Symmetry: C3
């Protein structure tokens, strides 16, 4: 069977006067992520990981973030691949993310037409190190397994 | 078959006053991590990720009365993975540290992790990098670990 | 069905007076990557992912930055030797995915050429090789153009 892996990375700046939206979840917070889209860093990383596993290039070449994630899933099926699983990590010093994880996972599973058991989201701080540790941005990493 | 992938990430600050333990191995150095075993946490997270069981924070709470060092957590991680129905196929990882030289300690880390995961030694890999003097990592202010894991249901 | 995954990371400083070589592509630029070999950050990251999947250690060990024979070494030759060792250990490569993170220059015009180089070196079709390019959204040493980072993932089978 023809399995493929993909990995994705994203980061966005935390700025005043934007809502904080991660994995489709709006999180109460003084700042939000800056981007041309809704800057959903988690969804962007998953999107890149899915495009990478299908060898379809990247999000910058192809393109709210859930609509884009749905379009990615479409283009991935279009190339003849089915999604097996997604795993990810959010790196954010603040705010606390644990209470929103299940919602993110629910959002992603719905967007990718996957059961909850094939979608995972993990949260981490950066132990006060670098721009992430100073709360200047939020990073997401993703890994996706697909099969043709 | 029903294969799944997971990925893991971890970082800790590097300062005088603590031992340096990476992958179960105490390494002589003028600094240490605030056991704070970056490599084992990353691998733990990667395993929980592949299993879709959340993350290290949800399983082993920083307050929970039952928690032990990072090898014990790794061992526990692996039993939870097994019970969800998953066999571990392989782990690969990278440690990024500007100093000390990590190459000498890799075989011991691979041995500890393989022991802890009940894996054949040739299914466990650890790699070493510096940050080429860039950022907090390159200034020796912290050490990062990265992990990938493949499992099967 | 004996599948294995590997992952890779690399970063090099971006300095004046060096060629900029990423994915085997020499990119016109006033700066280039600093290292012992040609400093091709993307190929090193993929090489690490491949050694990692086969559990063969790492590129720093197979191709040491302290060994003079690798001075100015062609990282495509290094990737091809890696692939040869991975094959020798019994693995076939199934796919590679990767990311390059750089403030500058624009990498989109060069991505297809990089993909082509990697596919050639690994004896893979283009449809099993992927290279993604981003910026770091102006953040950190990458945002300041002090270095270029690459990340990689590889799937192999014994
Ligand atoms: O680098 C942040 C970023 C750029 N980009 C383009 C499409 S989605 C997206 N995220
Ligand atoms: O980011 C450092 C860190 C946080 N955390 C929570 C459980 S194990 C662990 N390492
Ligand atoms: O850390 C940058 C680096 C060192 N090294 C040794 C062989 S390939 C390579 N890239
Ligand atoms: Cl940037
Ligand atoms: K990083
Ligand atoms: Zn983004
Ligand atoms: Zn940790
Ligand atoms: Zn390198």
């Amino acid at each position: 069977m023809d399995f493929r892996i993909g990995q994705g990375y994203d980061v966005h700046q935390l700025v005043p006067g934007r809502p904080l939206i991660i994995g489709g979840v709006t999180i109460p917070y003084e700042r939000g992520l800056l981007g041309h889209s809704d800057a959903d860093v988690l969804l962007h990383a998953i999107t890149d990981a899915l495009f990478g596993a299908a060898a379809l290039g990247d999000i910058g070449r192809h393109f709210d973030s859930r609509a884009l994630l749905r379009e990615c899933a479409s283009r991935v099926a279009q190339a003849g691949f089915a999604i097996r699983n997604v795993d990810s990590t959010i790196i954010a010093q603040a705010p606390k993310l644990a209470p929103h994880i299940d919602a993110m996972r629910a959002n992603i599973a719905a967007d990718l037409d996957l059961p909850l058991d094939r979608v995972n989201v993990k949260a981490k701080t950066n132990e006060k190190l670098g721009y992430l540790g100073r709360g200047e941005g939020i990073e997401a990493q993703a890994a996706a397994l697909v099969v043709r």
